Design a protein around this ligand. Structure first.
Ligand SMILES: [Zn+2]
Ligand SMILES: [Zn+2]
Ligand SMILES: [Zn+2]
Length: 72
């Protein structure tokens, strides 16, 4: 498996799963979030200030479902 790694653009929607995130900075991009188990979870969408990365593939960032359909 691989890691997404996408750099967030100013104003890009970011996705966090409150159930599976190891800490509050753990964030997924749109196309990963919708191809993962976390869409049926308690989640939150916030706008990125720019920078940071999509945490898809980072196994230590998630308690469950560290990968989406694209990256697994
Ligand atoms: Zn991503
Ligand atoms: Zn992904
Ligand atoms: Zn989740």
């Amino acid at each position: 498996g691989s890691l997404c790694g996408r750099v967030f653009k100013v104003g890009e929607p970011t996705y966090s799963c409150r159930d599976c995130a190891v800490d509050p900075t753990c964030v997924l991009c749109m196309e990963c979030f919708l191809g993962s188990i976390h869409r049926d979870h308690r989640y939150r969408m916030t706008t990125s200030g720019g920078g940071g990365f999509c945490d898809c593939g980072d196994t230590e960032a998630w308690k469950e479902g560290p990968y989406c359909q694209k990256h697994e």
